[PDB]
RNA sequence: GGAAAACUUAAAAGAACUUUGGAAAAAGAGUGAAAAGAGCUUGAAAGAGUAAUAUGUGAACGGAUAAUUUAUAAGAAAAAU
RNA sequence: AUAAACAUACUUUGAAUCGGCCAAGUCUGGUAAGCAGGACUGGCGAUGCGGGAUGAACCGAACGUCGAGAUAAAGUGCCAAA
RNA sequence: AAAAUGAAGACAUUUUAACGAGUAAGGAAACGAAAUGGCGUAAGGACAACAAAAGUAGUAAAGAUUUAAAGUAAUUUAGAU
């Protein structure tokens, strides 16, 4: 119908050389090449929507989502920190995450 | 009298102690769970204490883009804000967009630079009563079963009032057709094309 | 009214090397070895019980239902928590017969006291009934 | 000794068993593994071919030093043998169980080997005289064999 | 010099007749409150067998975090005037 | 001048211990040694954590269970956060 | 540690502040504001339905196998077989 989101790549969690903090996930929004273009996205919704091959004998949804918020910039290359309701699965590394346009501030 | 903790209950002729009151002097009580009182109902003109502060770009007659919800990507015209709920009362004129007279919170919309103005829209009704009258409610809990068919008959019985309050849309539709390419723009969907970076887009 | 019961660690503190050896049970024992990996708090294996893991004093020893536990062996035992039916809950002992369990259950309903073994040692009313 | 499993329908099944059978458990564990699920009208034919060395019994689990054979192609097992003593003992339990189905009134042509299990029995020790005045153990490996044949029919689940 | 080894049931009522088998035994049948069936009160761990389910490129196992599957598991009251 | 009241002064009873090792804007014997022995201090022993790829001693800093934030040594082509 | 209250509540009271690494080693019991706090095995003396039939038990004890709950832990508790 229409595209109302910008794809972001789940690069990985906030980490160090030999540590990992899955509370915060790092995202690379498409088209953001510097930390000065991040102020717009600080606070926008982010959704990790995935597909699960459920059986017809069940009632669980076949398309489930985990939502979260962009909270702060991370580095000088337009990388952001996102905190979700549940920590992202490491199986979803490098997949696409929808960066919505709400909560709007215009 | 009985202690504050003592709530006597009936015994089905089971063994009871000598100190427990018998059934002939015990009257049962209904379990009470509702303590907090509901919201007060006031006049139809005074603004609610819990009223938002709309953005300065959101003014009556402007065109908004709905970027979330069922009508995501559609366009609407902001008439006025519901003083009893704080949510905008918009109409994406049904003859063009198909968006009915509905209520949306201001956080899910983008205020464009397009301005249709349109005064004398005759919004005398279309208040919190109207939105509470055309809302579809569930089947409660004690109303037997009444499955499926309860909701279907609701739409038919509330359809006529929905059309009746569409006297608001008659003025805007004529004004919308005045601006060239505006009727096509309003009737279409808002989409993010290639090179459309949201931090670069301006409305 | 019921507060949020918060536990700082929901897992189990298993004895070191219990997974590898079956003679070593899973009940926790502090390692006293002079070269033990766990007792020196190596990265990866530094999980030992501490007083800091203790739960909040307000919500300690509290069942998920929101009440504490009070074992009962007869009907007269229930009379010690009739004033505190909103704070305690009856828990019939594991040796109480089925005949005595009904008398405790019937009286508990009369005294408005919850019972955590309300469906315990019941008769065969699951099949052919 | 009791049976590991009971039949779904007793009237559609027949049983036979043997206790403290003087046959190697490791060899019989593979013969009973090969004939599991095949019809009794076919197992009696497979067992005879093992006796005359025309069909292999793959040694899937106890394959230490067992030699490769030409009949072990397609079974995902490169090793096999022809245990004769183990096959004959099963051939006598199959005859006993089948003759019980006739007594019940069951139809032989529909019977399959639904359940067959081998368990470790109690060993009997002997003396093996070694060098430097040592004596070791010379112990048998008996086993219990249980068998349950059921009438195979198609099931339905609406 | 110098051991090991206790226990069926209340009562042997210690299966007893048929079919298969050379026989031992097996399947029925019966006794008993219950096979507790004599290698007999209960029957743990080590080791196996069967069934169900799941996983896989030079070890295996454990911990933190999520996803999937399964299981557990929170309710019958009810607004303004 | 500064600091010090859970300060200060202790009394009694007693455990373990006296195989040590390392660094150095230090020294003596030795050609020299990851050799042998000393003065002052700080460490390992008794000690995990972040960094130096890996390391008992080096650098930062010493640890009740966590949430969020600025930081330390040191890093910002990929493994690897920048 | 200091203030407040104190015959019995209860969670070993209320408030404030600082503190919490560790081998050998020490901190026996009791001590109301308690001079560390506790879990477990067996045996002995008492207590255990307060109206004269007073802990549980053939309407199923102890033991065993598991499923869940409480405790930082030692462990305890309950369901099913």
From Swiss-Prot, chain B:
UniProt keyword terms in alphabetical order: Cytoplasm, Endoplasmic reticulum, Ribonucleoprotein, Ribosomal protein
Biological-process GO terms, alphabetical: cytoplasmic translation
GO MF annotations, alphabetized: RNA binding; structural constituent of ribosome
Localization per record: Cytoplasm, Cytosol; Cytoplasm; Endoplasmic reticulum
A Pfam short name: Ribosomal_L6e
GO CC entries: cytosolic large ribosomal subunit; endoplasmic reticulum
InterPro entries hit by this protein: 60S_ribosomal_eL6, Rib_uL2_dom2, Ribosomal_eL6_KOW, Translation_prot_SH3-like_sf
Stretch forming the signal peptide: none
Keyword Endoplasmic reticulum appears in the UniProt entry: yes
Main localization of the protein described in the UniProt heading: cytoplasm
Function of the molecule: Component of the large ribosomal subunit. The ribosome is a large ribonucleoprotein complex responsible for the synthesis of proteins in the cell.
Quaternary context: Component of the large ribosomal subunit.
Record family assignment: Belongs to the eukaryotic ribosomal protein eL6 family.
Protein name, per record: Large ribosomal subunit protein eL6
């Amino acid at each position: 119908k229409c595209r109302l989101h910008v794809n972001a790549v789940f690069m990985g969690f906030q980490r160090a050389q030999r540590n990992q903090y899955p509370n915060v996930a790092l995202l690379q929004i498409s088209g953001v090449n510097t930390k000065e273009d991040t102020p717009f996205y600080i606070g926008k919704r982010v959704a990790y929507v995935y597909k699960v091959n459920v059986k017809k004998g069940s009632n669980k949804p076949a398309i489930r989502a985990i939502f979260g918020k962009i909270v702060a910039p991370h580095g000088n290359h337009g990388v952001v920190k996102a905190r979700f309701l549940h920590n992202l699965p490491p199986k979803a590394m490098g997949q696409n995450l929808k960066v919505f346009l709400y909560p709007s501030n215009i | 009298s009985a202690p504050q903790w003592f709530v006597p209950v009936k015994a089905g002729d089971a063994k009871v102690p000598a100190y427990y009151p018998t059934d002939d002097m015990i009257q049962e009580q209904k379990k009470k769970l509702r303590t907090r009182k509901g919201a007060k109902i006031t006049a139809l003109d005074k603004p609610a204490w819990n009223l938002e502060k709309l953005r300065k770009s959101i003014v009556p007659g402007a065109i908004l883009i709905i970027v979330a919800g069922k009508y995501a990507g559609k366009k609407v015209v902001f008439l006025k804000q519901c003083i009893k709920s704080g949510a905008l009362i918009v109409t994406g004129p049904f003859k063009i967009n198909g968006v009915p007279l509905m209520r949306i919170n201001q956080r899910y919309v983008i205020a464009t630079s397009q301005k249709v103005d349109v005064s004398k829209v005759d919004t005398t009704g279309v208040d919190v009563k109207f939105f509470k009258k055309i809302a579809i409610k569930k089947a409660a809990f004690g109303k037997t079963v009444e499955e499926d068919f309860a909701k279907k008959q609701y739409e038919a019985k509330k359809a006529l009032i929905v059309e009746k309050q569409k006297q608001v849309d008659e003025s805007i539709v004529a004004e919308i057709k005045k601006v060239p390419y505006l009727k096509e723009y309003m009737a279409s969907y808002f989409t993010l094309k290639n090179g459309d970076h949201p931090h670069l887009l301006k409305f | 009214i019921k507060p949020k019961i918060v536990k700082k660690y929901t897992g189990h503190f298993k004895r070191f090397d219990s997974n590898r050896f079956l003679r070593v049970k899973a009940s926790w024992r502090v390692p006293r070895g002079i070269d033990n990996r766990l007792r020196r708090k190596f990265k990866g294996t530094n999980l030992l019980p501490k007083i800091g893991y203790g739960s909040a004093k307000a919500t300690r020893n509290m069942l998920p239902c929101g009440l504490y536990k009070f074992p009962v062996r007869n009907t007269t035992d229930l009379e010690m928590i009739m004033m505190q039916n909103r704070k305690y809950a009856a828990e019939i002992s594991h040796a109480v017969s089925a005949k005595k369990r009904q008398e405790i259950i019937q009286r508990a309903k009369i005294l408005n006291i919850r019972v955590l073994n309300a469906d315990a040692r019941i008769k065969k009313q699951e099949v052919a009934q | 000794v009791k049976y590991c499993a009971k039949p779904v329908n007793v009237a559609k099944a027949a049983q036979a068993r043997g206790d403290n059978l003087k046959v190697h458990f490791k060899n019989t564990y593979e013969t009973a593994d090969a004939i599991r699920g095949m019809k009794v009208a076919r197992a009696q034919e497979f067992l005879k071919n093992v006796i005359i060395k025309k069909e292999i019994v793959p040694f899937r689990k106890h394959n230490g030093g067992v030699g490769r054979k030409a009949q072990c192609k397609g079974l995902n097992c490169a090793f096999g043998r022809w245990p004769v003593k183990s096959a004959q003992f099963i051939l006598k339990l199959l005859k006993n169980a089948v003759d019980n189905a006739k007594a019940k009134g069951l139809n032989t042509a529909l019977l399959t080997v639904s359940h067959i299990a081998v368990q470790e029995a109690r060993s009997s020790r002997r003396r093996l005289y070694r060098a430097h005045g040592s004596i070791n153990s010379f112990s048998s490996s008996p086993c219990h064999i249980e068998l349950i044949l059921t009438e195979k029919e198609k099931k339905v689940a609406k």
